[PDB]
Design a protein around this ligand. Structure first.
Ligand SMILES: Cc1cc2nc3c(=O)[nH]c(=O)nc-3n(C[C@H](O)[C@H](O)[C@H](O)COP(=O)(O)OP(=O)(O)OC[C@H]3O[C@@H](n4cnc5c(N)ncnc54)[C@H](O)[C@@H]3O)c2cc1C
Ligand SMILES: Cc1cc2nc3c(=O)[nH]c(=O)nc-3n(C[C@H](O)[C@H](O)[C@H](O)COP(=O)(O)OP(=O)(O)OC[C@H]3O[C@@H](n4cnc5c(N)ncnc54)[C@H](O)[C@@H]3O)c2cc1C
Ligand SMILES: CN(CCCN1CN(c2ccccc2)C2(CCN(CC[C@@H]3CC[C@H]4C[C@@H]3C4(C)C)CC2)C1=O)CC1(O)CCN(C(=N)N)CC1
Ligand SMILES: CN(CCCN1CN(c2ccccc2)C2(CCN(CC[C@@H]3CC[C@H]4C[C@@H]3C4(C)C)CC2)C1=O)CC1(O)CCN(C(=N)N)CC1
Ligand SMILES: CN(CCCN1CN(c2ccccc2)C2(CCN(CC[C@@H]3CC[C@H]4C[C@@H]3C4(C)C)CC2)C1=O)CC1(O)CCN(C(=N)N)CC1
Ligand SMILES: CN(CCCN1CN(c2ccccc2)C2(CCN(CC[C@@H]3CC[C@H]4C[C@@H]3C4(C)C)CC2)C1=O)CC1(O)CCN(C(=N)N)CC1
Lengths: 490, 489
């Protein structure tokens, strides 16, 4: 049962856990154990070796959004002279899912090869939990009464089990799915309700909108007034219009009260307001919660936050000295590259003895909505509270290609938020094609404390959308002590 | 004929000339005249109000490349489950050209509105030339014996007439076209030869490749071993492979010696080697030369360089005090945003009395090839001569989508060149989808003297191609005193 001492035992072979494990083994020559619940994607556990991103997150959803974008490309090609039989166009969901599955499986297999070929980096199949401060027990199932496969003696323990979809406690919740199941639907739904205002709901609404069979309809509902809270307000409003223009129904200030089955097997959703909707799939995407319930954290007294995340300091330390937590389990920025950076920083701190912490400010991120979002740093509302004088530079225009394409609704939006006292760029927010690619090097600019003048004195690359960031010299409006106004008082 | 004094007379209403004119009129309250040969795009002189970029350059080119990209999208859609009758797919070139024409004409019309609505900004139709230091004459044609339309008295003169396609002196050059005429072909050529290894040749090869009718073939020829001289060598090699994979024939070490007309109107090209090729169109894209012949610069003695550009200092000043030159006529970086920047800087210097100059280093640019290129700063061969220790960081990978799409040849290439003594990024070179958009903010990073660690300590955006720029920690190889090697001593 008991193992030889590992320097590090990682529970969860995902984005953060694999970076920590790999770095500890290869950069510092340490003996590392990594635990996960299966070696390949999909039911019943969905996540697997590689993590949520590889298996049921960033990687497959990006492939599926790319697939969905072809609906727009096929239509838009006509404006540039492409002609074909429109009545022959069919979207084969089964083919998409099969191709996605092969791609994810290849990644699963490549991670299996990493463990085989790397000395001092060992994989253990099963469910990890804390028996004591220096013992991780690996059992056959999530049930703590299931059979022990081994006990891993651990000098250090890393909790990196990620998050899991939140499901509301409403009648007929068992008739709904999450993003996990959406990845394995045997057929594309004719009618679908995506529940939530966040990026997962918005992204899947776009995917379903493109692959739906004839006479179909995608509806997104959100309990508050405006989707995508935490993103730039102009972009939130503008994405809503552009989703609507592509046939997606957006129900704001609406929330399901119950779901029941119609006699034909479809789902009848009743909302709190009294509204109803019949759909084939109800996909819940209202949040993700830290995955702590199976770790038996009470055995060692690892503290959780009020919201349920493992409580950590800036260096990923729990209240128990040799036990650390990174990634989505900490309930902060649920992004793969953040988990990776936290894992790397942790290993440098613990095994390199040079403390390093992840900077959670000015992190660039994206929403692969159609059209997509790219963002880095503060929205103007948040900046207006932290700084006395804030300037907002805004450009909004339909690119010339979309006059020709017939998608006149596709406005590109670029916004730069600054501290007007010294011109320091506090945030950049982009909506439109290429936005996720444009924003990466903007992340590097914000790390370097770029000012607005560093942007407008840089020579543009023409013709691009990106050059709009270097063409904004004069603020569109300001915030003075929190108060919006077009001009500054003298 | 002789006007009242203008503060500035601009010859050429293009990228640089319009920026200068607008800024001088609106920011400094000056009285400005701008001269161009046409009010809208197309034959006989092609460029017009708006410049080369608007009329027969960046703007229409980009729309046409966007059109061409749909051949790849339609094909690649099948990998993601899209099904349709492939046998019904046709590319209507006439429809592309008509849409392009409307878009460009709208821009021409908006520029007419600018002149109508702006006090002290006046447009004059005709051919500008220098009569004397303080007089620009506007004539009916480029012939200096043609009729005078008016004489413009000028306190300052800006030469901003751009450039023009270079045509080799071969027998049957009259049977060839340039990029100018390519924009107005009534039908897409079944067979086309694009002559030259530069960006225009490569871009048009991609355009013609997508719109060619059945049984078609695009051939690109270049007189030396490898296309795209001046770009990163890895990218030059890789883009050659990717063009070939999309069906374009690349003829290196070949150059046309003559062209004759076949009896069906097609062209018979004979190369210097003795090889021959029959094509429907021969597009010369061997270079662009400064447009100085019609300005009568000998009347005032404005100095040209040995290459033929108007000689200028770093502030765009000629050898004659009140006469300046910006844009492609200076024969340096032939890019629209550089011409614009030069025009703004000139006006601040002359009318603001606060001297400003354009920085011609670390300028980001793109090639809208399929796949496209984005680049900023130095290639490693140039860096290795100027710096003692240079590191090259390189990543080349086929993106995951392109396993599914069936275009496995579409490798993304990311290269960072640094001064290894302090880690300062000297250049960044990208090949693959998104490269032109990725490289813009990289331009800003280089202005801020970004080091390699500023890239690899920035958190990635995932999944993107761009995040490869933040994932390269260890050099792939070095140059030490100009000598390539895998490891340092
Ligand atoms: C639909 C969707 C789309 C997303 N898109 C993006 C995107 O575009 N960009 C982006 O940056 N982020 C995206 N994310 C977020 C990203 O997936 C996460 O932030 C990231 O995966 C978190 O990494 P981690 O190391 O915290 O945990 P994960 O990568 O989730 O790994 C946790 C692993 O632990 C395993 N595990 C759980 N419990 C146990 C146990 N008791 N014993 C052993 N193993 C266990 C799981 O099987 C899993 O493989 C997306 C998420 C979802 C759901
Ligand atoms: C096919 C092609 C594609 C290109 N693509 C790009 C790109 O993607 N990105 C990029 O940055 N650059 C591109 N360029 C380069 C860009 O177009 C030029 O750098 C830019 O237009 C130069 O601006 P300018 O002010 O020097 O002159 P121009 O914009 O060329 O303007 C010169 C004007 O002067 C007029 N003129 C000439 N002689 C006289 C006279 N005697 N009297 C009156 N008027 C006169 C012409 O009609 C013309 O309108 C491209 C060029 C070509 C040919
Ligand atoms: C009677 N035939 C004739 C063909 C008519 N069809 C069938 N069809 C279809 C699509 C998927 C599964 C089964 C049938 C389509 C539906 C609508 N079009 C939409 C094409 C869109 C419209 C604009 C842009 C996006 C895409 C572009 C043409 C590129 C595709 C073909 C269509 O127009 C078809 C059916 O038998 C198939 C079954 N039908 C159904 N379930 N409603 C319709 C009748
Ligand atoms: C960020 N990585 C840490 C992860 C380490 N490894 C090592 N490794 C490996 C595989 C076989 C033998 C030896 C080592 C891999 C390399 C490739 N990965 C696949 C990564 C995919 C690519 C696309 C998406 C899914 C996952 C994402 C990058 C998230 C599997 C395992 C891997 O990810 C740093 C690396 O330098 C590790 C070493 N690398 C390499 N040997 N090619 C490249 C990347
Ligand atoms: C179905 N018929 C007529 C359609 C054949 N055509 C005509 N045609 C065409 C294209 C432009 C103008 C005039 C006629 C094409 C030839 C070229 N292909 C292009 C294939 C594209 C290339 C990129 C993407 C779209 C499709 C993909 C590979 C999916 C479609 C249209 C095509 O496949 C075919 C036959 O008559 C010809 C072959 N047959 C025979 N030798 N006995 C019998 C059947
Ligand atoms: C520094 N200037 C350079 C030249 C100024 N003007 C002023 N102007 C104008 C037009 C009518 C009445 C008064 C002033 C224009 C506005 C935009 N242009 C249209 C040209 C488009 C804009 C961008 C690309 C597509 C085409 C390109 C210039 C190639 C016409 C002339 C213009 O370009 C830039 C702007 O003034 C241009 C106008 N701007 C805008 N509408 N948002 C941004 C600032």
């Amino acid at each position: 049962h008991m193992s030889k001492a590992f320097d590090l035992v990682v529970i969860g072979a995902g984005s953060g856990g694999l970076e920590a494990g790999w770095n500890a083994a290869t950069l510092y020559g340490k003996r590392v154990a990594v635990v996960d619940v299966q070696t390949s994607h999909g039911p019943p556990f969905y996540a697997a070796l590689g993590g949520t991103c590889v298996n049921v997150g960033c990687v497959p959803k990006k492939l599926m959004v790319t697939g969905a974008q072809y609906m727009d490309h096929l239509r838009e090609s006509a404006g540039f002279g492409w002609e074909f039989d429109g009545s022959s166009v069919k979207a084969n969901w089964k083919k998409l899912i099969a191709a996605k599955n092969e791609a994810v499986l290849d990644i699963n297999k490549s991670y299996e090869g990493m463990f085989n070929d790397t000395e001092g980096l060992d994989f253990f199949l099963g469910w990890g939990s804390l028996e004591s401060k220096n013992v991780v027990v690996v059992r056959e199932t999530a049930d703590p009464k299931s059979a022990v496969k081994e006990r891993l003696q651990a000098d250090h323990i890393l909790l990196a089990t990620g998050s899991w979809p939140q499901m509301p406690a409403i009648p007929g919740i068992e008739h709904c799915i999450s993003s996990n199941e959406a990845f394995y639907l045997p057929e594309p739904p004719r009618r679908v309700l995506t529940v939530g205002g966040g990026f997962i709901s918005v992204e899947f609404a776009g995917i379903f909108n493109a692959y739906k069979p004839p006479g179909g309809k995608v509806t997104l509902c959100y309990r508050n007034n405006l989707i995508l809270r935490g993103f730039d307000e102009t972009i939130r409003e503008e994405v809503t219009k552009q989703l609507t223009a592509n046939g997606i129904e957006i129900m704001t200030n609406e929330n399901p009260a119950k779901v029941s089955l119609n006699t034909d097997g479809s789902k009848h959703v009743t909302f709190e307001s009294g509204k109803t909707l019949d759909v084939d799939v109800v996909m819940m995407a209202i949040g993700r919660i830290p995955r702590t319930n199976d770790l038996q954290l009470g055995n060692v007294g690892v503290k959780l936050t009020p919201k349920g995340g493992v409580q950590v300091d800036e260096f990923s330390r729990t209240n128990v000295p040799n036990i650390y937590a990174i990634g989505d389990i900490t309930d902060r920025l649920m992004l793969t590259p953040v988990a990776i950076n936290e894992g790397a920083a942790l290993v440098d701190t613990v095994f390199g003895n040079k403390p390093r912490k992840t900077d959670h400010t000015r992190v660039a991120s994206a929403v692969f909505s159609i059209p997509p979002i790219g963002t880095c740093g503060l929205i103007e509302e948040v900046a207006a509270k932290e700084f006395e004088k804030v300037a907002v530079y805004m450009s909004s225009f339909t690119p010339l290609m979309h006059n020709i394409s017939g998608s006149k609704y596709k406005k590109f939006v670029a916004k730069i938020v600054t501290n007007h006292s010294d011109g320091t760029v506090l945030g950049v927010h982009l909506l439109g094609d290429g936005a996720p690619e444009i924003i990466q090097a903007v992340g590097v600019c914000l790390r370097l404390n770029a000012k607005i003048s560093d942007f407008y004195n840089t020579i543009g690359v023409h013709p691009t959308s990106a050059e709009e960031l270097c063409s904004m010299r004069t603020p569109s409006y300001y915030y003075v002590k929190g108060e919006k106004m077009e001009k500054l008082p003298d």
